[PDB]
Write a protein that binds this ligand. Structure first.
Ligand SMILES: Nc1ncnc2c1ncn2[C@@H]1O[C@H](COP(=O)(O)OP(=O)(O)NP(=O)(O)O)[C@@H](O)[C@H]1O
Ligand SMILES: Nc1ncnc2c1ncn2[C@@H]1O[C@H](COP(=O)(O)OP(=O)(O)NP(=O)(O)O)[C@@H](O)[C@H]1O
Ligand SMILES: NCCC[C@H](N)C(=O)O
Ligand SMILES: NCCC[C@H](N)C(=O)O
Ligand SMILES: [Cl-]
Ligand SMILES: [K+]
Ligand SMILES: [K+]
Ligand SMILES: [Mn+2]
Ligand SMILES: [Mn+2]
Ligand SMILES: [Mn+2]
Ligand SMILES: [Mn+2]
Lengths: 357, 357
């Protein structure tokens, strides 16, 4: 309870994992209780920032995360407006928030977090305050959300302000984060339910792929538009990995796939090059990563040990300035952006805000 | 001692392998000793049938085996003339035969066995009588050795008979064997030092390839000129496998391979399609073989345990009627055969013999 940035938050998988991470949860908890939630797999995460004045509720922005629920919103890349979420589903979300605002007695700013699994909208939480997304939203929308909510807090309704209709922008605005893993080498550069990033960037595009590509480049990525890609995905992702591989191939990448991931591609008509794990042969990935053999790496994991078992690729990839994704959705966006030219067109905030009708 | 067909013969890998097969070896030895011979790895096997009249030695034929030394002569396919052996080396063997014929006091037929390793002739054994290769060589050379040798035995010299020069036919002759593994399913259809074949066929061609293809077809092989091929080879064969894989590819085959093989092929630039062993996952080889996915199977093993590990490919390949090779040389030969038409041309023996000058 009473924490932001998911402080002391951890995905428990069993008995043990609990005893281990419970005290801590409590220590930061604030004489408030520790919630034990059930983990929604393959869920899309969503952030909603809104303003309620006791009369009305104004929808600031709906942001669809790239990375799935499980990866803190704070370490997630996000899109405004949504890039895959159905209108019907958004509308649902818009309603819930409203419901919440009022029930909550909200006055000023609020931020709501959801999860969309099998077309169902689940409630993650609500921050009865200004969230870290505001600036990004304000910038994307042209609507100085902090001002307004400030005004509201003071007595000047949204109506009196003349701010009542949710703004939907012409272009795509994508936020991407920057992680401090390079400062702390002894740390597993893996993402999760706890927030570890220090900053963020924003990409604006005609297309999601255009916005994404810009945010990525701005995030200081090392991603290349050619080369060899390494694909090492986890069981669940075994199905979509095939389509992502295809895109990479279409793009001119050559592929390598560790045992299990190759088995699947191949069974689908794609034959990657087999690569040996650390404990399998020589050369092994590490050698390969190290050799400046890859330009891209996609690696999904799942389970406390499987994670400590794959820690090496990540450390190496990070260590060798190789662009790497740890989420398949993340890989899909990375791929999509291959079809874009981050240095093609430049626009000003001014122009941006000018396109808004 | 005193056995033919490799009765009770076995390749031993350690002490205990030894203690397990020793008594059996003795039991069949005829109050004669058991030889312990160091195994000759990557060596070519050669058979030589000759007649000695105490005056002169007549070389009937030198047959080079397809399968290497270690696979019983009676279970190996063979070629007359030799198809890979240098003249220089064959000549070395012709002399050894003569030297032996004379020292041993041979009077009539004899059969000599050699192994070629590193351009070095090695003696395996001498069969002081007519051998199983006699009819084939006679048919191949047009010289009725049993008749000639019978006469020599009864008093008539080679000179007198006017059979004094070795015949080297204009065509290739290849012998192939038929194995009974299909009658005894609970058996691992592996080849070895002990003879298990029940019969043989003869293939005659303008080339080694033509000869082999004919031998292979008459041996009732299920081999196809297209399809998917399964490659699963041992460590030593890791070098020549590439060439083999390549050759299958140039022929239009589609490859599948297991882990290790796939690794090597990958390194060569060949990207087979990965296939799961039986302990690896699903579908696996067994499943795929069983499904009729394959038209050719090349599977080589090495060592008691590694043999017993791969037994299932062999047994399934058999049950499902897929052509399989258990030696790389075997595979290479098969490959060659791919470039020929066994149904193309036919020739009577009368006609073959007439082509001899
Ligand atoms: N039930 C759940 N299933 C899957 N993921 C979840 C679940 N609950 C939370 N998460 C993920 O874990 C993150 C952290 O949960 P949360 O309670 O929002 O932490 P927080 O510290 O309050 N964040 P914030 O106030 O925005 O700085 C969410 O952003 C989700 O990505
Ligand atoms: N040292 C060795 N290294 C490699 N292979 C060998 C060696 N000794 C024998 N072999 C193999 O073992 C087989 C059988 O040995 P061999 O002494 O010829 O048995 P055999 O019963 O007398 N045969 P046969 O009289 O021709 O029916 C040979 O054909 C070779 O394949
Ligand atoms: N949005 C967090 C950054 C993504 C990172 N490249 C990874 O795939 O983990
Ligand atoms: N001449 C021996 C038969 C070979 C069999 N196809 C296998 O390679 O074992
Ligand atoms: Cl580039
Ligand atoms: K997320
Ligand atoms: K042999
Ligand atoms: Mn919070
Ligand atoms: Mn949160
Ligand atoms: Mn013998
Ligand atoms: Mn022999």
């Amino acid at each position: 309870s009473y924490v932001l940035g998911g402080r002391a938050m951890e995905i428990v998988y069993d008995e043990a994992d609990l005893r281990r991470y419970f005290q801590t949860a409590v220590s930061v908890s604030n004489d408030a209780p520790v919630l034990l939630d059930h983990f929604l797999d393959d869920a899309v995460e969503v952030d909603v920032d809104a303003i309620c004045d006791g009369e009305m509720v104004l929808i600031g922005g709906i942001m669809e995360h790239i990375e799935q629920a499980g990866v803190h919103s704070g370490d997630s890349a996000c899109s405004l407006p949504a890039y895959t979420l159905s209108q019907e589903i958004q509308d649902v979300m818009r309603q819930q928030v409203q419901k919440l605002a009022f029930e909550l007695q909200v006055r000023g700013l609020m931020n709501v977090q959801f999860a969309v699994k099998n077309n169902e909208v689940y409630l993650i939480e609500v921050n009865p305050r200004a969230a870290r997304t505001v600036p990004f939203v304000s910038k994307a929308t042209g609507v100085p959300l902090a001002k307004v909510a400030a005004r509201v807090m003071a007595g000047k309704s949204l109506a009196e302000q003349g701010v009542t209709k949710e703004v939907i922008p012409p272009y795509y605005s994508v936020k991407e984060v920057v992680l401090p893993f390079n400062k702390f080498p002894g740390v597993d550069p893996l993402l999760g339910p706890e927030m570890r990033s220090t900053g963020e960037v924003m990409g604006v595009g005609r297309t999601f792929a255009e916005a994404f590509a810009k945010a990525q480049l701005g995030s200081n990525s090392t991603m290349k538009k050619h080369g060899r890609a390494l694909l090492s995905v986890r069981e669940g992702d075994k199905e979509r990995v095939v389509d992502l591989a295809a895109k990479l191939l279409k793009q001119g990448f050559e592929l390598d796939a560790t045992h299990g991931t190759a088995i699947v591609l191949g069974e689908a008509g794609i034959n990657p090059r087999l690569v040996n794990k650390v404990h399998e042969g020589r050369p092994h990935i590490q050698d390969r990563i190290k050799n400046g053999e890859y330009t891209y790496i996609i690696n999904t994991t799942s389970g406390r040990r499987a994670i400590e078992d794959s820690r090496v690729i990540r450390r190496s990839a990070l260590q060798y300035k190789v662009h790497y994704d740890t989420t398949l959705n993340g890989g899909f966006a990375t791929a999509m952006a291959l079809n874009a030219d981050a240095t093609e067109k430049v626009i000003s905030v001014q122009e941006m805000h000018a396109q808004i009708k």
